[PDB]
Each structure stands twice: as C-alpha cells, then as structure tokens.
Amino acid sequence: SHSVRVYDTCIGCTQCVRACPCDVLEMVPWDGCKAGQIASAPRAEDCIGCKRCETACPTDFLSVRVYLGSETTRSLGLSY
Amino acid sequence: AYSIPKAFIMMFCNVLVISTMTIQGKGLAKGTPHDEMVESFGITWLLAGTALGHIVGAGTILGCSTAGIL
Amino acid sequence: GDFLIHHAIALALHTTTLILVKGALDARGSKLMPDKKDFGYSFPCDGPGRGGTCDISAWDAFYLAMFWMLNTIGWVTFYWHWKHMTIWGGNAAAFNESSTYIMGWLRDYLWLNSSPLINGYNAFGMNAQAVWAWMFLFGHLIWATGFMFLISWRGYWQELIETLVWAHERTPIANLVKWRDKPVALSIVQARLVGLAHFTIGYIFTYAPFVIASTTGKFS
Amino acid sequence: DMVGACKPLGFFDPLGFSKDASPASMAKFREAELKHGRVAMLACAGMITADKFHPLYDGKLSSNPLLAIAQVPKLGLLQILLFIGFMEVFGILNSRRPDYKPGDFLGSSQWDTTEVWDNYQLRELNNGRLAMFASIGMLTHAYITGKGPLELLD
Amino acid sequence: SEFVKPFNNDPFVGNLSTPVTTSTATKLYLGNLPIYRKGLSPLMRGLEVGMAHGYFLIGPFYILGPLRNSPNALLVGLFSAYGLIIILTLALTIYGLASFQDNSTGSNLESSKGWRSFTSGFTVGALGGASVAYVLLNNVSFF
Amino acid sequence: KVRVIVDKDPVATSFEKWAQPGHFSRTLAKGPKTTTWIWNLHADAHDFDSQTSSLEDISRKIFSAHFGQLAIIFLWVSQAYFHGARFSNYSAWLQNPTAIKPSAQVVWPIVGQEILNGDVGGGFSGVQITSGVFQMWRASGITNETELYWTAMGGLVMSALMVFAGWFHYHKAAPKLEWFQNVESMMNHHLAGLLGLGCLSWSGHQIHISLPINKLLDAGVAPQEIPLPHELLFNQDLMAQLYPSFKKGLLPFFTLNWSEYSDFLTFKGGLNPITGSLWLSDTAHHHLALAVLFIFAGHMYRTNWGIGHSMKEILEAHKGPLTGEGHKGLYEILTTSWHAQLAINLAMMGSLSIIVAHHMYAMPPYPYIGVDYPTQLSLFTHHMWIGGFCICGAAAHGAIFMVRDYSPVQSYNNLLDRVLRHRDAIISHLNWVCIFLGTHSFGFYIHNDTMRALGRPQDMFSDKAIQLQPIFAKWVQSLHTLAPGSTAPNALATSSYAFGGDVVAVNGKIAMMPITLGTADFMVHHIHAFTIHVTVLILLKGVLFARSSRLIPDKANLGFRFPCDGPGRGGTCQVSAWDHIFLGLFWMYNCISVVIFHFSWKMQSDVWGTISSSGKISHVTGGNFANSALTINGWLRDFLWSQASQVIQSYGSALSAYGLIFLGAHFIWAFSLMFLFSGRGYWQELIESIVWAHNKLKLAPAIQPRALSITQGRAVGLAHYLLGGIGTTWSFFLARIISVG
C-alpha cells in the first residue's frame, strides 16, 4: 500500500480530507496550527494514489504527501 | 383541367381524402359530424384535405395515363 | 554538404547531451518537485497537481534522449553511407551537388537506393534479398507499433481490459478457465519502456536491411 | 387460457377437442400448432425465394420444390435431418421441463409480460396458420403443374 | 413488457437476464453440453470434449495446409492435428498444475485429480477423433 | 402558438469588452498570472455553455455566430467567383476544355516564385487549380467573365448582409428561447422552405439557362454567339427551337400531361457522350422531383394550425418489450441541449460528405470533370477527410452532452439509460469484432507477404492461388447493370458505368469505366471495415464511459476534458472522453488515408487512362493493382515508391511548390511526435532553467511562462500530426495526378 504522510507545515484547511475519495484522511487536534487541527492518515491501506489531496493542498509545497509503494487489490482499485 | 375523366378522378380523390382523413383523431370516417369538424379545424380541414387530394389525384392520373387506362 | 551535415550532427549531440544532463542534474529535485530524490529514479509522475507532472522522474529523460540518440546516429550513418556509396560508384559529384538540400537527401539516397531492397520479392519472383525486404517491412511494423504505446496511455487500456474481464467472466464455458493474476493494463513506466523498445528495435531492424541490401545490390 | 383466439373467427373450435382433453393434451396441441406454423412459414419463404433466386449448387437445381429436394445431394439431406433432430431433442427436453409453456423456447414466464406479448404471440399464430394453408397449396401446385409458386404466377 | 431483468433478482450484480443469457433454449443447451452435464465424471467430460474437438481439428490442416495439393495431404493433416492436440493437452496439464496446486477432493473439475482425469479424457478423445476423421476422409467415397 | 418574440436591445455595442480580453469567463476575467491564461482564453472562447447558464443567451450567441460563419462562407464563394473572373483562363478553357488546364491563381514575382506560374495553356501562366469550379460554372451556364464578376460582387453584398444580420440579431433584436425551441416550425421551414424551394429554384435555373447554353456548347456554338441568359429566359421561340416541348407552355404542367415535357425532363441515365458527365436534363428532372419531395415532406409537423405531427408523441409512441420506456425524454433532451443536436447533425453531415465523395467520382455530374483527373481525386479525397473529421466531432459532442447535459431524472429507463446499463457488453463485443476483423484482414496481407518472400506464390490469397472473391459485390454489380431493362424500364442506361456497360471516353482520356472487384478489393474492403470498427470502438467507448467507469466511478465530476486522475489505480491516463476523441482522430486519419490510397491506386490502374481508336485501353499504372495490392510490399513499392517520383522530381518546375509542401508536411508530422511522446514535467523543468537565465539578466516576464497543459500538449501533437499527414498526402496526390494526368 501507499504511504501517506503529513508534515507540520499544515494549516488545517481540511481540503485534503474533502478531496479524499476513500476516507483515508481525517482532521485530528493539534497545537502547532492556529486552527487547532492537522490532517492525519489512519487508513493508508485504503489509499489508491490519485493525489487529489496533493492537488488540493494550498501550501507552497505539500504538507500532505503520498509515496507510491506496494500494490494491492484496493490500491489498484480493481473491481475484479 | 382538360378531360372529363381527369376531372372526375380528381373530384373523387379529393372527396375520398376529405372523407377518410383524420386530424387529431377527428374525421368524417371516424363518425365526427361535419359541423364539429368545421368548428374545430375550420378551413384548414379543406385546405389540407384538398392539397393531399390533389397529390393523390396527380399520382393516380399520371399512373393511369402511363398505363393507358385513361 | 559536409559542413551542413556536421553542424546537424553537432545539433543532435548537443541536444542529446542537453536532455541527459538535465535529467542527471534535476534527478535529485526541481522547482516543480524539490523532493524527487525521495521518490527515486523511475516513478510515473506526481499527479495532475501543479499543472501536471508528466515525465519528471529523470528516467523519462533517458527515455526522451534515446529518441535523440537514435536520431543522431541515424543522421551520422546516413551521411557515412551516402558519401561512401557515391565514392564507391565514382559519382562523388552527386553527393557534392545534392547533399546541400533535404530534397536531394530524400531523393538521391533513400528513394534511389531503396529499389534493390523493395524489389527483393515482387509479383514476378524473388531474389536473395527477399529476406532483407521482409525485414525492412518488419522493422517498419515494429517501429509503427511502438507509437501505440508511446501515444495511447494507460487509462483507456485499463477500462478496455475491465470490459474484457467482464466478458470473459460472464461468457459460459470459457468462464471455467479463470486467470490467477488479475489482468491489468501495463504501468506507465512499463509502457514507456515497451514503446521505446519497439521504437528502437524497429529503427535498427528497418535500417540494417537497407544499409546491407542496397549496398549488396549496387555493389558500390 | 391461451392466445389463439382472434377476431375473424373468435374461439374457433367446432369439434370439441379443447374440452374433455387433458392440460397435457392441450399443451401438445399448441406445441404442434406452433411447430406446424413455424415450419410452414419456413417452407413458404424457402419456396418463394428459391423460385427466382437459387445461387447454391451452381444455380443448377430446379425451381420446382418437389424436384429440387430430389436433386439435392444425400449429405445435405442428412445434415438437414441432423439439424432438425437436434432442434427436436431440445424441444423434447423443453417438454420434460417442469415449467413448459408450449412452444416457448424463450422462457417468457420469467418476465413481466403484458397484453402486447399476447398480441405478438397471436400475430405469430395467425401468420403460421396462413403459412400452413399456403405451403400445402404451394406443394400441390408444384405437383400439379410442375412449376413453383412465382413461376406459376408468371 | 420488460424482457431484460436483474440476474437472479439482484440489480447490483454485473449481469442482465436477457433472452440470450437466460432463455430456456440457452439453459438447455448449456446445461446439456458435456462440461455442464449432470452426472458425467470428469473423465467422461474430457472424453466427449476431446473427440468433438479432434474430429474437426484435422480439416483445416488437411484442406488448407502446405501439402494440400500432395498425395500425403490427409496424413500431413492428421500429424498436424496430433501436434496441435499435444500442445493443447500440455496446456491443460500446466494449467492444472498452476491452478489446482493443493487439492485432495477429486471427482471435481476444480480439483487436481479431477482436472487430471479431464485432461486424460481430452487427450484420448482428441487422438481418437482425429483418427476417426482420417478414416472417414479416406473413405469419403461412401458418402 | 408558434410566434415571433424577441428582446429589443439586449446588448450594447461597445469596445470596452474588446479591450477586456477574458471578459466572457469568470476565472479569466481577473487577468493573467501565467501563460496558461492565454491558452485558456482560446480554449474557452466559444464554450458558451460554460461561459453562461442561460439557454436563451447561449442560443442567441449561437444564432449570431452562425450568421458570422455564413458571412465567411459568402466571402469564400466570392473569392472563388472573383478569381475566376479576374485571374483565370476560364474563357480559354471554355473554348477548349480538354486541352486547356484550369487555372485561377497567379503568383507575383518576388523571390523567383514566378516559376510556379506554369504553362497552363491559352496564353496564360498561373497555378493549376483542382477544385472543379470551372466545370461547375460550365454546368451553371456561365460563359463570360462579367457574369463571374457580378456574382462575386453579389456574394460580397451577401457577406455584408450576413455580418449585419449577425450584429442585428444579438445587439438589436435577439430572439427568445421560446422562439428557438420551435423545432416543428423549424423543420417545416427547412424542409419545404429551404431545401424544397432551393431545389425548385435550381431546377428552374437549369431548365431555363443551363440546358440551352450547355446544349449549344455541346453542339459547337462558341461562347461568343451563345444567346444571353436574359434573352433565353423569355424568348420562348428560341427555347422551342431547341426543345420543342417549350412551345406548349405551362398548360401541359397545369393539366397533368407531364409527358409532353419529356424532351428536357428525361430519365436517360448514364453519361453524356460529349462531355462525359451526367445529363443536365436528368439533373433538372432530379432537382424538380426532389423539390416536390421536400415540399411534401415539410408539411408534416404541427404549427399554429391543427393539422400536423408532434415529434414528442411520435417518439413516445415508439417503445418495445426490450427497450422499456423507449424514446421517452429524447424530445426534451434534443430541445434543451445544443450538444446532442450538434452531435447528430455532425454525424449526418460527415456521412453525407463521404456519400458525396463516393457518388461524384462514380457519376461525374459536371461537364469535362471526369477527364479532369486532378479534380476527381481532389474532390473525393477532400470530402472523405471532411467526413471523417465531422464524424469525430459528432462523437466528441455526444460525449460533451453525456458529461454536462445528461440527467437520470429525464432519462430514467429510456434508451439512453438502457444503453449505459450494458455499455460493457457493447464495448466488449465491438472489441472482439475489431480483433477478429483486423486479425483476418491484415493477416491476409501478412500471409501473402510471407509466402511471396518464401517463394510460394501458389500459397497466396491471390486471384489465382486462393481466391477470396466478393460474390455479393459482383452480384449487386450484375443487378445494377441489368437494372435499366428489367427493374428500371424507363431508364435507358445504368445509373453508373462503374457497375458495368460501355467505357465512356472523351477525346483520348477515359471519363468512366467499369470497376472490376477481386481478391485485392475483398482484402482492402475488409481493411476498411476493420478501421471503421476500431474508430467506432474508440469513439463509442469515449461516449459511453464519459459519465464514469469501473476505474473512476466519479468521472463526470472531473469534467469533459481533464488530464487524468493521478497515478493511482496503476495509472488513470487519458481516461477522459476528450482523450478518447484524441485517440480516435488518429484512427479516422488512418481509415481515411487507407481509403484514399485505395481509391487512388484502383482508379489509376483500372479506370483512368487513355483509349485508342482501335479500342486499346492503356491505364496510368497499367492495371498493377490486381496483382500488387495483395501484399504490403506491393503497396509500399508499386504505389508509394513508384508514385513518389513525380513529387520528388518536381524541383525546378511548376510542381516545385508541391515538392516543398511535401517536405514541410513531413517536417510537421515529425515535429508533432515531440508533443505526442513527451510530457509536461520535463518541459516545465527546462522552462525553469530558462527562466533562471532570463532572471539573471532581469527580463523574466511578469506573466510567468509555463509548459503547456497536458490536454493542450495532446491537442497540439494531434493537430500537428494531422496537418503533417494530410499535407503530405495532399502534395503527393496533387503532384502525381497533375504530372501524369
């Protein structure tokens, strides 16, 4: 499965979770950001790797980042 | 028009078309009275009826002339 | 003609070096992707975000420079073969006069010297160069087949394979025979590799019959 | 009950048959009716087309229906018989099935059919009846005159 | 009057109950073919399939082969059919090896023993069918 | 009630939004920040549906845009007529059509390009034309240049009128959506009013001006002594001298003695022996019959009066057991969505252009056009290409409708829904058809090549080794040859001489000749079928999977054209219906290229040529198609290599322009492969390096440069590919045919 990571440059815009089509990402409380939340990836096994989170991320470089890795049925998104 | 057979054929075709035509489910052949057809459709009932009567009359007259029947 | 073709060779060498040097130096990272070293050498892309990130991995700079390698060596070998064919025929004036323009290159080298190859086999019979003619058209076919992989990309073929999977699973009799590995379209890098290999192999297998068969038929 | 009843004759059954007969007998009657109609339609179409358009066998087989089959080779007749026998053993298995609907190889009891289905079934039945009369007429004309249908019409 | 409905009353399965898929004729023909016939052992299924395929495999090679216009046309066609049947049963054996790796049930096409029996029946039936077709084509003057 | 309702002064006439470039688009109205803004401007220029949300405004914009297009077309017709009037040898060609080469373009002497003004005969130097306009005007009856000049001026006036109408119907009096949605009245007026009266007026023009002038010209009267059309129009005595039935007047029309006009309203068929083209009396009768047919057709649909049909009820009445609700909702779809109408109309327009190409070569309609071999090849190839392009536009706009204007509420359980619900079966079966057809058709060629290379001609799929005869095509040809006696008794000759009959020839050259079909024709026709089927596979898959697919359930959300959905799921590259169109354009290019190559080789080998007095028939290539079209080697040698001589050897002659365009088209085709194979990331990094170089000298632009978008790179590659290929074939065909014919 792919590896989803979130770096502390996040600004709690919750747009990665909205762009997420597989419920891989969720907001959790945090101290560093003023919004008091940070994206996290507790369900990376469901990740497919379309990087809509990366597309929607507005930071100068991506606070949320996806590294493609081992392929599975879920990651390949095969209905068969 | 020149020939009495041609006039007879055209008149018969026009009358047949006017009798057997149907507009929006109303027609003389379908037991709609003449007065009701006149009120519902007006002179559009005669204009379309005689136009198609002339078309079918031309078709039958030209066919009969080709076949030598006339 | 030698002046012009040498400057063309310089163009091709400098462009190939440009592509390869840029790939090598931007392999670690770039302004569009400063963390490329984390992804590695050969990865498909970074997605459509940031305007699109096709062919960014610096393996794709090998892929793209292989085309220029084939181009430059093709120009070099065309130059050598024509300048030597004319001199072997004692007709160097033809090269000195016609090599100064591309129509002369297309007419007096390819079209003129392609006759003994394509006439390896015809309707009236066949010669010992029939094998070379077959191969010229076979290299043509492989080169053309590479264009499919190079132009058409993965999503179309993945959807098509999904339809074929549906058909195989739903047909009777044949559905008793069932795969073990789920069929999928070729990966992005895989298909780039396959298309490049088809391009290169068609290139060599369609030029080798020409350079050998024309030289053999003319014997000069 | 069934679909055969039609406007010109209504429920045509002067000689009983329908009553005092088992449901199996009624199903057999309708299966035979549909088989006769279908075979007769095929025969009528074959005679009509083969009178004036017979490209097979180098166009040498006669237009007479009662002599073309005589001139057809033995292997062709054997293959036609084998095909018809295969269709008929499928019909026999359909008869043995527990949800048989006389003549219905399509199933048609497992879909939400409506009155249009019955109307189309009646269309099949009436065309089959017309072909049943017509094909026997064609064969009798061929025996009498020696000409086929369209040749006789000429 | 709908004629295309969900497959087995399941709208969310990727299929449709069309006349082609589900009609009584289709059900009868498919279920009575050897691969789906009831009570046939895997050997019998393989045997029937084998003779059916080996009977017709000879014909293409016999008529359209390189030695069609030769006195040994039929013999060459039979040898070609034998070679193709050898390749086919090798394909069957490797397919069984790859698919039915671990199995102890038997008497089922989806088991190692059952598939081996099916392949054996196919091989014997195909060889016999090709030989019978050779004999018939030699004695074609009968028909 | 069908009525006219418009809004008065809906838009002000001002240049403020000329100055503001991206006014139409919400996103582009802000201003440029990157060079992608410039590209997006042109990409979204005419996307009215994306620009606004009012169907009324979209319809008004479309209507006035159509007026602008009509103005451009009128200017184009004006250019044709005016150049014929002024810069052409039309008078010399009219005096001597067989010997004089038509030409209506002259190049100035600037850089030695005056060599292109070749010797075309008649004491005139210019560029030979291949549009057939000379034969068109000869058919129309134009015999002098004042007529060409005046019709050119009239065309200019019409173009100005169209520009004025386009301005008026958007800025002064724009119609309403209620006016636009009167499809029944529109169909009535276009059938009876546009097509019917157009055919009627053309038939009148023919009967009054074209039959007399053409008959006199064929008799031998030179154009100077021809009576003028205004004289012929009312001089019934001269018309009676020419066609005796004209002395009877219009009474034989009003009374149904239509047979009296048999002399100038004929059913002869075949080709006129003098001009080697269709009889103009037959053409006049044809157009008159069509006028009657269309005026009859145009009274079908309902309007303000009670009589008439309604397309809504006609569609809703057509539903069957295997289709559920049937055609319910399609009337609403086609009344609300412009893209569906565009799709249907483009498909029909393209197929009709292909039919025009197939008919014009087989039945040469204009005088001396059959012997004009460049004109026939040019018109056929042109219309085939236009047809393919229009068909792919049809597929693209069908996909656009599916993405944007589709909605299940209106299409619950109709034909569109039922088609979407088994698109998988449709595409899988077409996939099998494509594989089977391509395998067999191209494997015939590959088998033949292999056997020839192995020295086994007896094992080939040839006319004498293993015949694949087109029995059905031969049967249809036989029926069409026997038709004039049996099934078309009043027709004297065949509809076309391609099916069979005599060999029509004018002077030495052959206008038409029977086209015999054999094994090579079987193979190439099945190749055509395979190519058409694969193009349909790509386009139909793009249309059906526009909404979604097993790979992307929410493909409709992304849009119509989008680059991808990331590298997930193994890679979702080119999943868009736009990318399906991009792939299908390559395939129609392949299809039409093979079709035109087949046409060119078959006609030069088997129809075109010269016939001697003794009856010897000598063809351009010598009938080599039947034996050399069996192998790809023969296609490469006896067609491409053999006929490229006239192109490559063109330097220093009038066809040097064709040689230069040949090389340039090759260059552009090769250039396109850069865009087709490369990717945006490489070019963006290279642009970053170049931007650094510019920033070092303090000249990096405020509008930051960017690599082209992925969709744009694909579009640019496709456009350059198509331009290069079509230009290569254009130069090759024109040079070859002008040199040899």
Ligand code: CLA
């Ligand atoms: C042999 C073919 C055949 C068969 C098996 C049937 C069977 C049936 N028809 Mg009949 N039918 C037929 C031909 C046939 N039909 C033909 C050609 C017509 C057109 C006139 C009709 C018209 C018709 C109508 C209008 C109706 C039926 C109906 C029925 C059903 C009830 C009557 C019954 O039991 O008849 C039993 C029939 C037989 C046992 C066949 C043999 C009959 C005698 C013994 C010999 C043949 C008669 C006669 C000598 C003909 C040949 C001479 C000459 C013409 C050469 C039943 C399913 C009714 C129905 O379906 O209601 C629900 C119904 O409404 N049929």
Ligand code: CLA
């Ligand atoms: C696809 C196109 C094609 C076709 C039609 C043929 C045809 C032929 N080739 Mg081949 N050939 C091809 C491509 C093709 N070739 C290519 C691409 C090459 C280059 C490698 C060659 C190279 C080649 C050589 C070197 C030779 C041939 C030869 C032959 C002949 C015999 C081959 C043979 O034994 O087949 C055997 C075929 C079969 C056992 C089965 C074929 C498929 C069956 C009939 C399909 C039935 C489907 C059925 C309807 C499905 C539904 C059934 C259900 C309803 C019950 C034959 C004329 C030989 C010859 O003598 O030529 C004259 C020969 O020496 N070919």
Ligand code: CLA
């Ligand atoms: C009746 C004809 C017709 C109409 C009205 C439309 C209308 C439309 N199309 Mg188009 N389309 C057509 C035919 C038509 N199409 C055909 C034949 C095809 C098949 C190729 C397409 C394929 C197509 C696609 C795939 C798409 C559209 C789209 C669009 C929309 C935006 C177009 C735009 O703004 O372009 C403005 C104009 C330009 C950008 C300039 C284009 C320049 C071309 C590519 C090259 C011209 C080369 C020139 C002729 C020769 C150069 C020679 C050289 C030597 C210099 C618009 C609704 C787009 C959309 O989003 O639709 C909703 C879209 O994605 N169309």
Ligand code: CLA
């Ligand atoms: C010469 C170059 C080439 C070749 C060989 C192919 C081949 C194919 N393309 Mg195409 N394609 C090309 C260029 C080419 N393409 C280019 C440049 C593009 C980019 C625009 C595309 C884009 C494209 C798309 C988008 C699609 C295709 C499709 C197809 C397939 C069509 C179905 C078919 O007939 O398969 C049969 C195979 C052939 C015709 C190839 C030659 C066959 C010979 C005769 C041998 C066959 C016999 C045997 C099995 C093998 C030989 C023996 C061997 C064991 C040694 C096929 C695999 C379509 C597809 O997949 O449809 C199912 C499809 O969707 N192509």
Ligand SMILES: CC1=C(/C=C/C(C)=C/C=C/C(C)=C/C=C/C=C(C)/C=C/C=C(C)/C=C/C2=C(C)CCCC2(C)C)C(C)(C)CCC1
């Ligand atoms: C259904 C159908 C169809 C199809 C058909 C088919 C598919 C057929 C086939 C057929 C065939 C394909 C047949 C076969 C046969 C076979 C046989 C008859 C065989 C035999 C064999 C034998 C007898 C053997 C023997 C042996 C053995 C076993 C072993 C050892 C050796 C020996 C020799 C002893 C069609 C299309 C028409 C249409 C309609 C329906």
Ligand SMILES: CC1=C(/C=C/C(C)=C/C=C/C(C)=C/C=C/C=C(C)/C=C/C=C(C)/C=C/C2=C(C)CCCC2(C)C)C(C)(C)CCC1
């Ligand atoms: C009876 C008969 C027969 C048969 C026939 C048949 C079988 C037919 C079929 C037919 C058919 C089978 C038809 C079909 C048609 C179709 C159509 C007509 C369609 C249309 C479509 C459309 C119009 C579309 C549109 C669109 C697009 C394009 C895109 C988007 C969407 C939409 C929808 C908008 C025979 C031969 C024996 C002969 C005698 C008679």
Ligand SMILES: CC1=C(C/C=C(\C)CCC[C@H](C)CCC[C@H](C)CCCC(C)C)C(=O)c2ccccc2C1=O
């Ligand atoms: C070559 C190439 C480029 C480089 C092209 C770029 C950056 C755009 C080039 C457009 C030019 C500027 C158009 C005008 C060219 C004129 C000759 C320039 C002189 C005029 C100036 C005043 C602008 C891509 O960006 C690209 C992107 C995606 C897939 C393939 C490719 C691709 O193949």
Ligand code: SF4
């Ligand atoms: S920067 Fe990315 S991860 Fe952080 S809040 Fe914004 S969208 Fe979410």
Ligand code: SF4
């Ligand atoms: S289409 Fe291909 S190259 Fe482009 S972003 Fe998607 S995976 Fe990368």
